[PDB]
Amino acid sequence: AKVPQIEVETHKVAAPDVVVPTLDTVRHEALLYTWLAEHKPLVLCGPPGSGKTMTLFSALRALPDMEVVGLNFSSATTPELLLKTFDHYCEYRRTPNGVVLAPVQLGKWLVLFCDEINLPDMDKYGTQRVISFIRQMVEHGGFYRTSDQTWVKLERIQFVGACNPPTDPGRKPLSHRFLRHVPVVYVDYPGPASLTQIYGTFNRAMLRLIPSLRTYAEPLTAAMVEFYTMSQERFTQDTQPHYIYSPREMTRWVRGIFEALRPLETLPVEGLIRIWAHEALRLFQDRLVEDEERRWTDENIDTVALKHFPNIDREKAMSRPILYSNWLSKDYIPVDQEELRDYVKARLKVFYEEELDVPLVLFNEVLDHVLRIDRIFRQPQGHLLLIGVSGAGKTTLSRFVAWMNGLSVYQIKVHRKYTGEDFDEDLRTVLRRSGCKNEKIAFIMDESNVLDSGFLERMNTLLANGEVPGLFEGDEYATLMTQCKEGAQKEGLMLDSHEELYKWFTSQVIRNLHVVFTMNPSSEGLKDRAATSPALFNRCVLNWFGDWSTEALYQVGKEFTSKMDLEKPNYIVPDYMPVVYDKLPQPPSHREAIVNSCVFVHQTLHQANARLAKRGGRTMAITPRHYLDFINHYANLFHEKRSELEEQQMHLNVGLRKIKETVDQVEELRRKVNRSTALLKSLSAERERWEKTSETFKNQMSTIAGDCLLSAAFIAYAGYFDQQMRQNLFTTWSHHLQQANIQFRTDIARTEYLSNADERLRWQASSLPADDLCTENAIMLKRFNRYPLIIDPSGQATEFIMNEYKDRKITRTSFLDDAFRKNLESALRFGNPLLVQDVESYDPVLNPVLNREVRRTGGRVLITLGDQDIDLSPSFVIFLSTRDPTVEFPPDLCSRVTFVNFTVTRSSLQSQCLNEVLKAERPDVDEKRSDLLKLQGEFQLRLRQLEKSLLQALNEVKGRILDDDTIITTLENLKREAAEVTRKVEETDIVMQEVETVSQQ
Amino acid sequence: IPRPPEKYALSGHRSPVTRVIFHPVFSVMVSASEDATIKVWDYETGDFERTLKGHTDSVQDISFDHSGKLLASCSADMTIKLWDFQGFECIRTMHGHDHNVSSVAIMPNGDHIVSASRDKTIKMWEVQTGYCVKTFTGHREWVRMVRPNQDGTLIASCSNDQTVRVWVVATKECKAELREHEHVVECISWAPESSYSSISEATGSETKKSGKPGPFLLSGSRDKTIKMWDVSTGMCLMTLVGHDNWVRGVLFHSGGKFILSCADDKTLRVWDYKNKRCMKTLNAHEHFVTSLDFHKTAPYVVTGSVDQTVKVWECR
Amino acid sequence: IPRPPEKYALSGHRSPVTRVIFHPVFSVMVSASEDATIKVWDYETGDFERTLKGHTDSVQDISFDHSGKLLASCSADMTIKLWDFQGFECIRTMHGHDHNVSSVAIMPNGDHIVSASRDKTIKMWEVQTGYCVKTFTGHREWVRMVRPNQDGTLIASCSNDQTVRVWVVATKECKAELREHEHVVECISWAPESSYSSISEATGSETKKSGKPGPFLLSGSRDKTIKMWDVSTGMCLMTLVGHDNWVRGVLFHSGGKFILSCADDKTLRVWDYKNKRCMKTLNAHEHFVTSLDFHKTAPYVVTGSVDQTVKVWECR
Ligand SMILES: Nc1ncnc2c1ncn2[C@@H]1O[C@H](COP(=O)(O)OP(=O)(O)O)[C@@H](O)[C@H]1O
Ligand SMILES: Nc1ncnc2c1ncn2[C@@H]1O[C@H](COP(=O)(O)OP(=O)(O)O)[C@@H](O)[C@H]1O
């Protein structure tokens, strides 16, 4: 009856200050007006997004002497929040014939809008402190201030709360002794017809921009409502806490469609359907966690679009990569995937020179995410919440898009001492930069950068209100007031009053401050984080990055191994191939099988982690940074092994050619001779194996792909596991590679292939146990991309590293030591190795240097530690270590460093026991054992030296045997190696057997 | 006004081109690239003439003096070299900037150089010796470009702080702080005196007591818009929109009738400001267009690019 | 035309230099030698750039493409290596093609390559995959040099059988078998169109119905004679004599007005073929000269030699 069918203006559609008069709205608004005019505190209980806040403001704007103050309740709030709110706005604490509290603005009441009032946690014995405070200051009409223990009576103050049903998880019922003074009104979700009419008016207002889609106003609305209803009856909150779909989603839907239609002049129905589907994907396809729900959403979006528009060109409207951007063009328009990829590649090349010289691969997912984040940064108050595994690129993508949008990215520098006061000062800094001296800011927070719940509540109020009350107190208030006055004069606004300048500052902060919260997808942490801060789930759009899909892993693998010579024309495709990549071509080439096996290995790590978790102890999380390290190791190892084999073959071939020339010489002299024939026979004794090696060169080159793959996978992934799990992982990888007919030289130990005996001698002499696991761990310490972390119960690896880098003046330092910074700085400016212990108390200032956040300055790489920026020396290497095998590290450090586990093996323990018992029981035999082992190592070193020097000299000579030096060198070399073989064979026959027999008992 | 038929496509650089300029007298054109090579071509015949090595890292900007005998270049190695163009030799080198120098220009008086760098300051050097004499400070971020006015009594510098500051050379005082762009300002350019009166006609700006309309200035940014400011009043006379990407270079037509500009949209755009008559578009390069220049007398235009190819267009 | 004073004599190779070529666009001089390394030089300032040691045995011939982004090299290791000049690394190493591969070439289409070896055949490979599809046979002995025509429809091969064959790429037939040299033919070269008309009055060749003078070819041999051949007719147009030893390389000046030759006589000779006016001879090297090249635009020539020194000369 009293619900006019108003027609909204073609602009300001779905604006914050507009509502289509419906039956429920006019009834509830009248009831709220009745209760508020009586100054009776009240409460609105309904599901989030029902329309409680808008109805309250509609009722309030009718009252002209009634001004509202917002308040957001978390689950960690105390009456101190209300006390600060009253101190900030109700300055008058006057006490004429009794203490009374009143606002400055005389003749005006005050409504303290407390939202989510039932979140505040109830302590033991079931009591809510702020609820009890409200019951006291309502029923008794006042409170007791703690300053003087005097009764303060409220004047021109009233309370309205907004809450949710008790059955809603995270919610707790209020006490009946409190519900007496506050009437409750239940606001439900607008019904199907109600939504149809409410948003139908919005759609008809919006489509008036294009006077050719007017006839499409009534179908479009219905379609949206249809789809919306499905999302309510399919993605319930019973599955994950963030699956709440409210009319707010339909509001931001209409707003997005309208904004995508504002600058554009003419557009067919196909474009409208495409924009509608893109918006529905940006509102219903992002918060989803798993791919099944995503496929369901895509199927039903296309289905409802086809149902509500029977005469449509499906392909033109519904293409698969539904992308939109305002980078390629000046107007928000669709963009093809390939042009966007090329453009973002070029822009990222520029970005590298700007910041973060760390390279990035651009696969399909990256493009989608950067488009979403750009959308959110373009909004006035755009708060984003990225949930994905650490290292997936959330922070770097956010910084990239923020740089694209001109935002000055500002992140807090969390440390061990970091406390509430430090974070308050950081908030003061960012707010002072944003409000006064206006400049856009991409304030990036991480789920680990929050230490105290005070940080969470401060971020909650900053996000929701747009301004934290009481942060600038005393002198800070006056200084901010002065700065805001200067900024207003610069902008042109003439403001003098305190509240006018404060409101201007709050508006500026809302407009020019975007918060990006990056969090890890931890189960049962989503609900807890929602309870402790509802703003993240109300005032922040949620983007579920998740973990890189097999498709994404395949793309990055191919992109980085686009330089490797993986082509094998004779690669026989097996009868059965284990398909891991969803879109793997069924007749794949060699490269498309190598990358498939790479993604299979990365998927194998997840199964191994699950198996360890089910029966065993702690498991370290697998991140995309591990895959990046695996691919970098694979590429580097391929280049190194290929170069070594090619150089070896070159030297062998040139030496054999010189030997053939020598044969020509001796034969043409025979057709001074005895020495020639003697050297011919002695050299042919080696020529036989030289020809064997030259023949097998092709075989070795054939199997260089699988071997490098297995070695890289071992030295990049199985750095944390024990011997049994390492062997099982390697066996599974080998079985899969054999299934894919990938060539790899079997019967060759990984430790021998990765490391030659030359450096193994130095390691063993450098106090390293002579066993497989310790050799592999040393290999991992040698070839590393992210700086290592040593997890050793015993301290052996510590002195191993100390001796290995002793020649470089390696310095010993610990996190706990106060001079840790200075020493660190010294290393950063001097390029001397640094070993850091006590990693449990990790200092996050190391986060940039671990990620190599260097900046090229025309030849000098520059790194920022904390807030001070220092040049970096290329000789700088840093190591991390601890003595606690069972200890938990902060999540931010989990993906930033390689892990090497120095466990003990049954074989190593047996060897140590045997060596000690032979040292004690039979000291003479132990002395023999030690002197023969060292002597054998010296013989092997000499064997490698003389053998290599022979080839080097043979290559160097460009003449013939007539040279006087060559003959004497070759004769002395052959004599020396024969004599060395004599000692080797005799010591391995007559003295090693006796030692073994003695040790056998 | 240049038209779609390019006259020559000169390609020799192994790295993206950054700046291209015309020698004020001789019929010779110069292009600086990111391979530290100042390659010198001939635009009349489309022929390579001779390269100029000497810098260690990418050259960001180059400029000639009033007589053209000297060529000052600034590189990413924090070095500003000076070149005896008659002899093709580096007669002097200047250091002092904390990070890379991304701009350079010679005073029209011919007795000083100005440079802008990522160290958030602008330095001024003397030609006779090479010693820094003045240091303009006040920018809060990377300063991208500095370009003095015609008589040399003022300079203008744009920076990543999304502001354009007009400085007084005589006393280092910040005469104006024009800040209305929504992104990083990439390029600026002064208004030649011949266009002064025409400016007053296009924007309707009113004249002051002295009769001088007040020096005008252009600012291109990554906000895809080209704003035009009046220095004497510090207000945005007009804005020009239409680019599909970040504006990289912007300049006035010698006749004071068109505004030429190049952006990363791979297009050279000729815009009209008096009557908004022409909005000509040229698919200049297959990749980003980094800089452009218009010959003062001869009817030619040159544009650099990231595709490592310089192009010469004829004006008809 | 190249004159007495060598501009630079770059000496970095450890083995006799085999072949030297120019990069199509960048100012880069590439050399291949017997030490299984491919060296990169800057012929503008005589500077060293990079050495590529990927090959196993001595490198015989190298070749760029039209765009200068890929470089195909051949060596006595029975492999053909595809070097991505952009990344200076191997993107493909095609195997097979038995025995010492003598020459490799990229056809102007830029998608396929040809290779000639000791195995009495010439194989064509795809750049995309590297799989052998066509394998020309018919030569009775070692095939030394192979170079396609400028449109990619024909190839030419010289061999130690003292016969030079012109093959059609499309259908594998021997279009011509010109067998007239007195000794083994070492080098062959096609003619640019800019000199075809010149050939018309040089040898008195008559035109056919189509009006084209006909495709032309050249062959230098150990017989100290250089033959110029008409592919259309298979006749010996003209023979040029005067070299004191085996001719190793022969090519046309970019102007289509002189013929350049490098031979085992340790001298490079510039002859005139239209009027026989010029017979200039310069003492190129103290030892054998293995290959010669002329820059398409720059007035620079480069000569490789057994003495492991690469000499660059200017043209005036
Ligand atoms: N009848 C309606 N008219 C206009 N907007 C409505 C209507 N019903 C719901 N909405 C929208 O629903 C959302 C409700 O937000 P809000 O009132 O803050 O939520 P809550 O119910 O949690 O307090 C807003 O986006 C609002 O525009
Ligand atoms: N798509 C990617 N391609 C290449 N490197 C990437 C990619 N995503 C992230 N990285 C690397 O990960 C590191 C950045 O991690 P960061 O984004 O801070 O982690 P988080 O995902 O926890 O926010 C850098 O080493 C960066 O190069």
Q: A347-366: buried (b, 16+ CB within 10 Å) or exposed (e) per residue?
A: bbeebeebebeeebbbbebb
Given CB atoms, is A405 within the 8 Å cutoff of chain B?
yes
- Collect all residues of chain C within an 8 Å Cβ-Cβ radius of residue B13: 26
Residue A710 CA to residue A604 CA, distance in Å, equals 13
Helix/strand/coil percent split, chain A, to 5: 55, 10, 35
Looking at the domain that runs over A335-547, which CATH code has it been given?
Answer: 3.40.50.300
Domain A755-902 has CATH 3.40.1440.60: no
- Collect all residues of chain A within an 8 Å Cβ-Cβ radius of residue C56: 646, 649-650, 653
Question: CA of C56 to nearest chain A CA: how many angstroms apart?
Answer: 5
Residue A466 CA to residue A506 CA, distance in Å, equals 6
Q: A690-726: buried (b, 16+ CB within 10 Å) or exposed (e) per residue?
A: beeebeebeeebeebbbbbbbbbbbbbbbbbbebebb
What the block records as the tokens of A306 is 């086809």
Residue B125 CA to residue B133 CA, distance in Å, equals 6
Q: How was this structure determined?
A: cryo-EM
**C26 → closest Cβ in B14, B47, B53:** B14
Answer for the pair C176, C215: CB distance below 8 angstroms, yes or no. Answer: no
Answer for the pair A370, A393: CB distance below 8 angstroms, yes or no. Answer: no
* A53 annotated ligand binder: yes
Q: Which residue has the tokens 């409680």?
A: A52
Answer for the pair B305, B32: CB distance below 8 angstroms, yes or no. Answer: no
Q: HSE-up of A428 (CA within 13 Å, CB side)? A: 16
Chains that touch B (3 or more CB pairs under 8 A): A, C
Given CB atoms, is A565 within the 8 Å cutoff of chain C?
yes
The burial of A841, by beta-carbon neighbours within 10 Å (0-12 exposed, 13-18 middle, 19 or more buried), is given as: exposed
CA-nearest residue to A567 within chain C is C92
Helix, strand or coil for residue A997?
helix
Answer for the pair B121, B140: CB distance below 8 angstroms, yes or no. Answer: no
Which atom of ligand 2 lies closest to the CA of A518? Answer: 23
Q: How many angstroms is it from A851 CA to the middle of ligand 2?
A: 9
Q: Tell me which ligand sits closest to the C-alpha of residue A628.
A: 2
List, in sequence order, the alpha helices (H) in A335-441.
337-354, 364-378, 394-404, 420-434
Answer for the pair C9, C311: CB distance below 8 angstroms, yes or no. Answer: yes
Q: Which of A156, A53, A145 is nearest to A111 (CA)?
A: A156
Distance of CA B263 to the CA centre of its chain: 13
A162 within ligand 1 shell (Cβ under 6 A): yes
Q: How many CB atoms lie within 10 A of CB B261?
A: 25
Answer for the pair A352, A360: CB distance below 8 angstroms, yes or no. Answer: no
- Collect all residues of chain A within an 8 Å Cβ-Cβ radius of residue B243: 330
- Max distance between CA atoms of chain A, in angstroms, equals 136
**A563 → closest Cβ in C36, C77, C91:** C91
Q: Do A565 and C91 touch (CB under 8 A)?
A: yes
What the block records as the tokens of A919 is 């040292």
What the block records as the tokens of A956 is 């160097």
Q: Which of A54, A13, A294, A90 is nearest to A162 (CA)?
A: A54
Q: How many angstroms is it from A392 CA to the middle of ligand 2?
A: 5
The CA distances from residue B198 to A17, A636, C111, in Å, are 46, 63, 56
Mutate to test the pocket of ligand 1, among A232, A251, A465, A539 (most ligand atoms within 8 A of CB): A251
From 2.70.150.10, 2.60.120.20, 3.30.1340.30, 1.20.920.20, which CATH number describes the A908-1000 domain?
A: 1.20.920.20
A8 within ligand 1 shell (Cβ under 6 A): no
Question: CA of A855 to nearest chain B CA: how many angstroms apart?
Answer: 10
Nearest CA to ligand 1 atom 12: A248
What the block records as the tokens of B47 is 């022929």
Q: HSE-up of A246 (CA within 13 Å, CB side)? A: 15
**A265 φ/ψ angles, rounded to the nearest 5 degrees:** -95, -60
A254 within ligand 1 shell (Cβ under 6 A): no
Answer for the pair B109, B99: CB distance below 8 angstroms, yes or no. Answer: no
**A404 φ/ψ angles, rounded to the nearest 5 degrees:** -55, -35
Q: How many angstroms is it from A246 CA to the middle of ligand 1?
A: 8
CA-nearest residue to C75 within chain A is A650
Distance of CA A548 to the CA centre of its chain: 11
Q: How many angstroms is it from A624 CA to the middle of ligand 2?
A: 8
* Structural domain boundaries in chain B: 2-315
Answer for the pair A259, A378: CB distance below 8 angstroms, yes or no. Answer: no
**C32 φ/ψ angles, rounded to the nearest 5 degrees:** -125, 140
Q: Do C298 and B48 touch (CB under 8 A)?
A: yes
Nearest CA to ligand 1 atom 3: A19
Q: How many angstroms is it from C161 CA to the middle of ligand 1?
A: 92
Beta pairing, strands B292-294 & B279-282? unpaired
Residue C145 CA to residue C176 CA, distance in Å, equals 16
User: What single-letter amino acid sits at A491?
Assistant: E
Nearest CA to ligand 2 atom 18: A395
A170 within ligand 1 shell (Cβ under 6 A): no
CB-based contacts of C129, cutoff 8 Å, min separation 6: A567, A569
Q: Which residue has the tokens 């990619």?
A: C152
List, in sequence order, the alpha helices (H) in A755-903.
757-765, 772-782, 796-804, 820-830, 847-851, 891-894
Distance of CA B171 to the CA centre of its chain: 24
Q: Tell me which ligand sits closest to the C-alpha of residue A19.
A: 1
What the block records as the tokens of A977 is 């190696």
**B53 → closest Cβ in C25, C26, C45:** C45
Nearest CA to ligand 2 atom 5: A360
Residue C280 CA to residue C262 CA, distance in Å, equals 12
**B230 φ/ψ angles, rounded to the nearest 5 degrees:** -105, 115
What the block records as the tokens of A841 is 């108390």
The burial of A166, by beta-carbon neighbours within 10 Å (0-12 exposed, 13-18 middle, 19 or more buried), is given as: exposed
CB-based contacts of A933, cutoff 8 Å, min separation 6: none
3-state secondary structure A600-623: HHHHHHHHHHHHHHHCCCCCCCCC
Report, at the CATH architecture level, how domain A550-707+719-739 is classified: Up-down Bundle (1.20)
Answer for the pair B83, B71: CB distance below 8 angstroms, yes or no. Answer: yes
| Residue A283: its H or E element | helix A269-284
Residue C316 CA to residue C306 CA, distance in Å, equals 27
Q: Which of A723, C56, A150 is nearest to A714 (CA)?
A: A723
Domain B2-315 has CATH 2.130.10.10: yes
What the block records as the tokens of A750 is 């990984």
Residue A264 CA to residue A326 CA, distance in Å, equals 12
The CA distances from residue C266 to A249, A671, B141, C294, in Å, are 85, 35, 63, 18
Helix, strand or coil for residue A684?
helix
Given CB atoms, is A997 within the 8 Å cutoff of chain C?
no
The CA distances from residue A51 to A170, A194, A223, A250, A537, in Å, are 20, 13, 22, 12, 17
Q: How many angstroms is it from A590 CA to the middle of ligand 2?
A: 29
Q: HSE-up of A274 (CA within 13 Å, CB side)? A: 23
Helix/strand/coil percent split, chain C, to 5: 5, 50, 45
Answer for the pair A703, A638: CB distance below 8 angstroms, yes or no. Answer: no
Residue C71 CA to residue C69 CA, distance in Å, equals 7
Nearest CA to ligand 2 atom 10: A393
**A442 φ/ψ angles, rounded to the nearest 5 degrees:** -100, 80
- Collect all residues of chain B within an 8 Å Cβ-Cβ radius of residue A858: 56-57, 75-78, 99-100
Q: How many angstroms is it from B98 CA to the middle of ligand 2?
A: 29
Residue A286 CA to residue A548 CA, distance in Å, equals 15
- Collect all residues of chain C within an 8 Å Cβ-Cβ radius of residue B47: 297
Nearest CA to ligand 1 atom 20: A49
Given CB atoms, is A646 within the 8 Å cutoff of chain C?
yes
Q: What are the contacts of C244-249 at 24+ separation with CB within 8 A?
A: C246/C183, C246/C186, C246/C221, C246/C222, C247/C186, C247/C187, C247/C220, C247/C221, C247/C222, C248/C186, C248/C187, C248/C220, C248/C288, C248/C289, C248/C290, C248/C291, C249/C187, C249/C220, C249/C289, C249/C290, C249/C291, C249/C292
* Structural domain boundaries in chain A: 23-186, 335-547, 550-707+719-739, 755-902, 908-1000
Answer for the pair A99, A93: CB distance below 8 angstroms, yes or no. Answer: yes
Answer for the pair B24, B64: CB distance below 8 angstroms, yes or no. Answer: yes
Q: Which residue has the tokens 């013989």?
A: A939
Count H helices and E strands in chain C, helices first.
1, 28
* A51 annotated ligand binder: yes
CA-nearest residue to B309 within chain C is C25
Which residues, judged by CB distance below 6 Å to any ligand atom, belong to the binding site of ligand 2? A 358, 360-361, 366, 390-396, 518, 625, 628, 851
CA-nearest residue to B77 within chain A is A858
Residue A675 CA to residue A669 CA, distance in Å, equals 13
The CA distances from residue A34 to A27, A30, A161, in Å, are 11, 6, 16
Given CB atoms, is A647 within the 8 Å cutoff of chain C?
yes
Helix, strand or coil for residue A848?
helix
- Max distance between CA atoms of chain C, in angstroms, equals 54
Beta pairing, strands C225-230 & C235-241? antiparallel
Residue B111 CA to residue A946 CA, distance in Å, equals 68
Distance of CA B86 to the CA centre of its chain: 23
Residue B160 CA to residue B140 CA, distance in Å, equals 8
- Collect all residues of chain C within an 8 Å Cβ-Cβ radius of residue A646: 54-56
Helix, strand or coil for residue B246?
coil
Q: How many CB atoms lie within 10 A of CB B260?
A: 24
What the block records as the tokens of B314 is 């004829």
Given CB atoms, is C130 within the 8 Å cutoff of chain A?
yes
Q: Which of A750, A739, A737 is nearest to A705 (CA)?
A: A737
Going across the sheet that includes B259-263, the strands are: B247-252, B259-263, B268-271, B279-282
Residue C114 CA to residue C145 CA, distance in Å, equals 10
Report, at the CATH architecture level, how domain A23-186 is classified: 3-Layer(aba) Sandwich (3.40)
Residue B125 CA to residue B145 CA, distance in Å, equals 16
Q: How many angstroms is it from A387 CA to the middle of ligand 2?
A: 14
Q: At what angle do helices A624-670 and A704-716 cross, to 10 degrees?
A: 140
